[PDB]
């Protein structure tokens, strides 16, 4: 609501300046305010939204994994206070808010108005931020958060299979689903999806310009290293 009196174009301009500044909280705040203007988002504006929230949740995820480990060492001959647990909690509570903020923007109303394949294949974002909630969930809803993410990934997978070529960078990035398969305890599903996705992009590379070629090979290489680490 903070950005409600600033112009849509002004928020886009300041979101890119925030990127250059590496002020990713401002960048998320601008792009949230841009989303809340009610207009659909251009392919470029989609990337600014995604890039901003990825960096904020990305440092929150990094800090959480640091605290969680000191906390595990704290409970194994260990000299005993609640301070590690309290701070790991607060940071995690902060992380859960940011995911809940992104999911609320996809749900109001970015997914319902996304009609084209490229825009709708937001469901990936929806899968990513439930996966982040999954990474920290330990209770009576961890099974339900995982299904929330899996279902979102699977909707994006069906549209991407039917509507985009096998080298399409959005399809290749979507095929994160494989890493979910570290959350879902399905490492064979993880590896099959990656070798299948890789091999079919490889067979389609002859159709691509030198520019498209470089884009697709980038993400195929992220699949190659993952396969390399799992095999």
């Amino acid at each position: 609501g903070a950005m409600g009196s600033m112009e849509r174009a002004s928020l886009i301009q300041k979101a890119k300046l925030a990127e250059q500044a590496e002020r990713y909280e401002d960048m998320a705040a601008f792009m949230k305010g841009a989303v809340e203007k009610g207009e659909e988002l251009s392919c470029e504006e989609r990337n600014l939204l995604s890039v901003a929230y990825k960096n904020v949740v990305g440092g929150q995820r990094a800090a959480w994994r640091v605290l969680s480990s000191i906390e595990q060492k704290s409970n194994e001959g260990s000299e005993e206070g609640p301070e590690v647990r309290e701070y790991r909690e607060k940071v995690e509570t902060e992380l859960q808010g940011v995911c809940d903020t992104v999911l609320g923007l996809l749900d109001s109303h970015l997914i319902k108005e996304a009609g084209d394949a490229e825009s709708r294949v937001y469901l990936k974002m929806k899968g990513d931020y439930y996966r982040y909630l999954a990474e920290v969930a330990t209770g009576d809803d961890k099974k339900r958060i995982i299904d929330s993410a899996r279902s979102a990934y699977q909707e994006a997978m069906d549209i991407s299979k039917k509507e985009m070529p096998p080298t399409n960078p959005i399809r290749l990035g979507l095929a994160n689903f494989s890493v979910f398969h570290e959350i879902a305890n399905s490492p064979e599903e993880a590896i099959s999806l990656a070798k299948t996705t890789f091999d079919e992009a490889m067979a389609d590379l002859h159709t691509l310009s030198e520019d498209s070629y470089k884009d697709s090979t980038l993400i195929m290489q992220l699949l190659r290293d993952n396969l390399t680490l799992w095999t």
Binding site: S50, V51, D128, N176, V179, L222, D225
Partner: peptide
């Protein structure tokens, strides 16, 4: 080294 996910952090 961690596994790769789309996208990355600055």
């Amino acid at each position: 080294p961690r596994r790769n996910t789309l996208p990355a952090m600055d």
